[PDB]
């Protein structure tokens, strides 16, 4: 056996505050979809595509300024081997049972020059299904490429259907394709949050927090979805519970899970586990940081070997953990 772990720490300065961050890789370069939504006298909302050039984020187009959208829209962005297609879909405040969705579509063959046109998913599949923004990429199901907008049910008391996606095979213009998710461990009185689809080598999987009723904390869950008949998927909970550590993010390298853990729910120290064998402790007190931690630690896969581990230990400061792994 030949393990080959290799980490290097770097920093990125962002002169633009971001309420939320969305990281993606394209053309082997790192980008962020920043939400600059400040709430003051002159402060307005902006959604920026931003590419890291050296040790600092460079602001490219603000995509949001085109959307007649009146507020905070859902961001489902997808990356392909030669393009990026993004969408800002509408929210469902109280009873915004808009029987049809209305998002925009943004397209680029360079991540800079972006072109837009408003799309309308009339009688959309995910009616009354709650949504949570994310980055993804094309999943292959039966020699067909699909971008997936996946959502979740609000509450559960009646046994069942409780998680579902709509799909596009025309770069996210048509969403008539219904993908079923059969996760049979949806207990009675549980609510799922921030559902993001982890996609790799045409294998479907989901990473989502769980708002515990007894506790008041959100616990990470990762499920592995198996394909049954055409467009039918049955999922199962992959266990990652670690003795005195909290589950955080999950990726794959060499076809092996590269998982993320914190010491406690406050995240003073984080640990990365390559196939549950080799660990690496990342000390967030780099760049002279007293008030530092690893809350919101995330993975940006760049290759079946590379993947970055990024978190923001303070405002306008990004800690880049440049991971490389080669088990052979």
């Amino acid at each position, epitope marked *: 056996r030949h393990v080959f772990i290799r980490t290097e720490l770097s920093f990125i300065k962002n002169n633009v505050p971001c309420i939320r961050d969305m990281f993606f890789i394209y053309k082997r370069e790192l980008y962020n979809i920043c939400l600059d939504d400040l709430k003051g006298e002159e402060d307005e909302t902006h959604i920026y595509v931003q590419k890291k050039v050296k040790d600092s984020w460079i602001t490219l187009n603000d995509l949001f300024k085109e959307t*007649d959208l009146t507020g905070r829209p859902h961001i489902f962005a997808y990356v392909d081997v030669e393009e990026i297609i993004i969408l800002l879909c509408e929210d469902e405040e109280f009873s*915004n049972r808009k029987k049809d969705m209305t998002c925009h579509r943004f397209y680029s063959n360079d991540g800079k020059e972006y072109n837009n046109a408003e799309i309308t998913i009339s009688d959309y599949i995910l009616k009354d299904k709650l949504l949570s923004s994310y980055v993804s990429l094309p999943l292959k199901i039966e020699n067909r490429e699909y971008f997936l907008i996946c959502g979740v049910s609000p509450y559960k008391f009646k046994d069942d259907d409780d998680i579902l996606c709509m799909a596009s095979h025309d770069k996210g213009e048509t969403w008539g394709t219904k993908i079923v998710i059969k996760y049979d461990n949806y207990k009675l009185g549980v609510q799922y949050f921030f559902l993001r689809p982890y996609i790799s080598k045409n294998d479907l999987s989901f990473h989502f927090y769980v708002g515990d009723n007894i506790n008041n904390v959100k616990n990470v869950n990762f499920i592995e979805c198996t394909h049954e008949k055409d467009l039918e998927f049955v999922c199962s909970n992959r266990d990652f519970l670690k003795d005195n550590k909290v589950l955080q993010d999950v990726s794959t390298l060499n076809d092996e899970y590269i998982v993320s853990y914190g010491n406690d729910n406050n995240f003073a120290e984080c640990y990365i586990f390559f196939n549950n064998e080799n660990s690496i402790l990342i000390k967030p007190e780099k760049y002279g940081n007293t008030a530092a931690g690893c809350y919101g630690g995330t993975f940006v896969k760049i290759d079946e070997n590379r993947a970055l581990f990024i978190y923001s230990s303070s405002q306008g400061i990004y800690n880049i953990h440049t991971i490389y792994y080669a088990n052979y």
Partner: antibody
Amino acid sequence: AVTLDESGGGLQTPGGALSLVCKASGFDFSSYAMGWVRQAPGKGLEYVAGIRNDGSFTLYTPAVKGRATISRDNGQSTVRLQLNNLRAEDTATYFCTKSADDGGHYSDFSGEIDAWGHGTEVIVSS
Amino acid sequence: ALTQPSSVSANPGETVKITCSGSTYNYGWYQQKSPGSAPVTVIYYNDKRPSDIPSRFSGSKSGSTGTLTITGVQAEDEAVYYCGNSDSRNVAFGAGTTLTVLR
């Protein structure tokens, strides 16, 4: 039967304030965005203030910005517009309007109106 | 801004087309017979037409330009027609196109 009853628009005074209320019936009030439009005599139409279905979003024409305060009471089915330090330029007929959408997009305010009121001639003079 | 012709004129029966340009979202056309009188929505949501409005009224959007088409114009169809939309994330109306019927 959809109705829009304007109430509180007549002779006002320079430097003063107004409280233009609008009563709506014949539809689910708490699901549509409402707004106020004004036509200055000898001039065309002009959007004044718009408010979202859940009242969480508001917009104002650069002329009234900082002086107008469009509010709404979904329970009572009303949409009260308050304008302050009334100028000579604020003389116009004010119409209460109803969008056939929640006001999710900016165009919903002046490009999706499916209901108007009689109006109210507001005059600003001493 | 939302540019709209100052005036347009045609003989009764002729098809009339009023353009409004500068926005690519939902167009709304509102007719007003006399300045001061309550306007009536002719077309809302680009092409949607209210029940109590004649079938001769129709709407269509192409890119950032909308066109109100009145096939076979009559006497009552004389009025200042106003377009409405979002002009660059701002709620705004057109200048007004006056319909003088060439009888």
